[PDB]
Design a binder for this molecule. Sequence first.
Ligand SMILES: N=C(N)c1ccc(CNC(=O)[C@@H]2CCCN2C(=O)CNS(=O)(=O)Cc2ccccc2)cc1
Ligand SMILES: *[C@@H]1O[C@H](CO)[C@@H](O)[C@H](O)[C@H]1NC(C)=O
Ligand code: NA
Ligand code: NA
Lengths: 251, 11, 28
Amino acid sequence: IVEGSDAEIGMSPWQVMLFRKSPQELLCGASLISDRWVLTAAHCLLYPPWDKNFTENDLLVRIGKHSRTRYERNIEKISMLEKIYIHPRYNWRENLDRDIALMKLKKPVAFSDYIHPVCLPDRETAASLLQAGYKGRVTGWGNLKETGQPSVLQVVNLPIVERPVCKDSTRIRITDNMFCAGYKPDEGKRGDACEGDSGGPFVMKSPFNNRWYQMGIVSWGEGCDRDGKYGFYTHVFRLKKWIQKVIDQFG
Amino acid sequence: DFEEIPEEYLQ
Amino acid sequence: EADCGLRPLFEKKSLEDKTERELLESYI
Ligand SMILES: N=C(N)c1ccc(CNC(=O)[C@@H]2CCCN2C(=O)CNS(=O)(=O)Cc2ccccc2)cc1
Ligand SMILES: *[C@@H]1O[C@H](CO)[C@@H](O)[C@H](O)[C@H]1NC(C)=O
Ligand code: NA
Ligand code: NA
């Protein structure tokens, strides 16, 4: 996260770290959506142009973390993966369309003050909150600058951007399965996700029921926190039918 | 860079 | 599930984090 701040303890209890077993390193962010299911970006697991193709036994999920590098004894919980599910129409060839994946844990994780699932949006919540100008929150342990790494989880609030502005900012083909967020040059304030924040959640707090909903997944961008560029996020609600199908069949 | 995790999780 | 999106150290205790108000203020 660029131009963000340190998270508060327990501020993002659904934040998940995807952790590579060998060598031991951060792979991506992700989010906890139930006691057995974790949501992330497909490109965190599969990206052939970079020779990336992780299998279940390659990875661990670390939940309840704050410190990036420390083993947070008696606080974090570490889970093994039972199975990965990548969206069958994930477009890694072109533009990361449908950049979404689920991971089922071998065993249910125990909820605590530091570990708790985020909600997924219904159609109405999405319609009401996914509007240009409305701000969401992105969190992660990714890079602090485009070209170091944070001691603890970082947070930044960013406004959703009008679709035509998103489209005009890039040469990449944008789809209905993505949205973009970030400040415009004229707005003065800044902030963005970056490398390492991939797969982490873009969340909004519903003013109707005061619950946090995950509207987006950190997906792609051109550099980080560049003037006139915006971060792109997987549109979680648009892909919710796939999410439910996977959980219904394999849960 | 990262602190070592308990061996149980790597088994 | 039924308790999704309610943080133990914030919503559950009626405490607000330092910047959530920024979000609420944007929901115009
Ligand atoms: N918000 C940000 N600035 C942000 C930047 C980077 C990331 C991490 N994601 C990534 O690095 C993903 C994975 C594969 C290619 N990729 C990109 O962001 C590439 N961006 S790019 O080259 O400028 C344009 C591009 C987008 C999608 C597919 C191909 C090319 C996540 C967020
Ligand atoms: C990625 O790994 C799986 C399993 O090892 C393999 O079947 C697949 O063909 C590989 N490449 C993909 C999914 O593009
Ligand atoms: Na364009
Ligand atoms: Na920007």
